[PDB]
Amino acid sequence: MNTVPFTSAPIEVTIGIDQYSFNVKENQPFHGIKDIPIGHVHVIHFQHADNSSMRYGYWFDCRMGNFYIQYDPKDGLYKMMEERDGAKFENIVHNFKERQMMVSYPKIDEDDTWYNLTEFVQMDKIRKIVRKDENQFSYVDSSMTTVQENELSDPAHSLNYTVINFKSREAIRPGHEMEDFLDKSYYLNTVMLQGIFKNSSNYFGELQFAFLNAMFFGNYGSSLQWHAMIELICSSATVPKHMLDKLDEILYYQIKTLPEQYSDILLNERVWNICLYSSFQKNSLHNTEKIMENKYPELL
């Protein structure tokens, strides 16, 4: 079990750690989060009490180094940094754990939610979507746009998700125009899976990371990306059976975890009705259709 210590909490802020969150008051004696499960990526995020504008946060994996948070009063945000002196880190963390100044990552033992939301998400791949190579962690916020969004404006601060466009030369073989637009199997299997992602585990990882950025930061382009990657599978007549079963499980936990009050903005009516009721895979997502109909029947 690992720890993200905090130099201090100088501004009132709601801190999130994965799907958990807690309020910290202005200059409260808060010095970080302990008992973080090793083996998963994590995200630590922030919403200032004063400015609900700009949720932001940091994807990280505690196996890749000792990370702490320090408020920067110039830039005005809580910043993730790496302590490279490992003894200074153990000493500082032990000092605070003894003074009981840390919140414990509150995982219930029965609870596999975070695992199920991040099964295929890997840090190395997150770092390629969020390009900032001097750091082992990755910053994301509400306002960041995607590579595809910048094509339709600062390239350093973008989300480089894989570009998916159903009306593109990449998606449509000359002479198979009708075939490939109504059945996207060519584009999913040859172009994306075989060509770009190499395997379905990388495809799923990008889709899970897209969803998590949409949910935690209200990042619009991430939501677009999530929906697109679902639609591409649902609109392929030919999808490996293991991918369909795995997708059903993925979506199921995403829909389970989504805040009930955010469904109106995070869920695309058209994509979901199409996927569940019209597409080739309308009968292949039993768990996802069942929770969608029982929780968000309004959308359908």
Binding site: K167, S168, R169, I172, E177, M178, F181
Partner: protein
């Protein structure tokens, strides 16, 4: 974007454009089978592609053989249309290719857009106008060449005959759409209006009668009377 009453004169500027109408591509007769079930029999069709500025009509005839062994023919008809429009543009020299293609039905937008991905600078637009191009098969010489075809075939016409020698393209298009609107609302009356007498003949190289200016005014008035009438007959007013 879409084309409507407000941007109507754009049709007659100097940017090459084509209307495409697919309403006569997939045509059937519905009949009873010996077992008392219903079956369709396809008949020849056509794509109505029209330059509204010059009157050039590229009438791509759709032979029934193209439906043989195919499923979901109404969907396929839309993609066949787009495939034939795309082949048409590629056959034209660059300076003759349209800068816009306007589709008369919105269901053609995706099939055409996908078939024209090679032409990013050709704008595919819908329209809000209720244009009467479906009535093109009420034009005898067009009906005739579609029904007589024994293979796929493209035939080129000028649907304005020689009108542009005397009137503008805006007026020629107004005449054309009044005539077609009439033919669609009451084909028999419309056809009676045009040719019951023979001292105003259709030249061998034309589609419509050789009316004088003064006869076109009378004709045009008779078609409006017809259209307003059928519209009362239809709503009783």
């Amino acid at each position: 974007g879409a084309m409507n009453s407000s941007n109507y004169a754009e049709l007659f500027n100097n940017d090459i454009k084509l209307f495409v109408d697919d309403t006569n591509v997939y045509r059937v007769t519905v009949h009873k089978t010996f077992e008392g079930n219903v079956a369709t029999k396809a008949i020849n069709g056509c794509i109505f592609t029209l330059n509204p500025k010059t009157g050039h009509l590229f009438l791509k005839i759709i032979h029934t053989s193209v439906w043989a062994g195919q499923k979901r023919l109404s969907q396929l008809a839309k993609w066949k249309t787009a495939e034939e429009v795309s082949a048409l543009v590629r056959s034209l020299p660059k300076e003759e290719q349209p800068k816009q293609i306007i589709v008369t039905r919105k269901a053609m937008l995706d099939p055409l857009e996908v078939h024209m991905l090679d032409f990013p600078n050709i704008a595919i637009r819908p329209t809000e106008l209720r244009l009467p191009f479906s009535a093109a098969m009420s034009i005898d010489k067009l009906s005739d060449v579609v029904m007589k075809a024994t293979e796929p075939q493209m035939v080129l016409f000028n649907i304005y005959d020689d009108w542009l020698d005397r009137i503008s393209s805006y007026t020629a298009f107004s005449r054309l759409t009044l005539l077609l609107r009439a033919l669609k609302t009451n084909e028999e009356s419309a056809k009676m209006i045009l040719l019951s007498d023979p001292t105003i003949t259709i030249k061998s190289y034309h589609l419509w009668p050789s009316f004088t200016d003064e006869q076109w005014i009378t004709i045009e008035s008779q078609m409006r009377d017809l259209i307003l009438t059928e519209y009362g007959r239809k709503y009783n007013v």
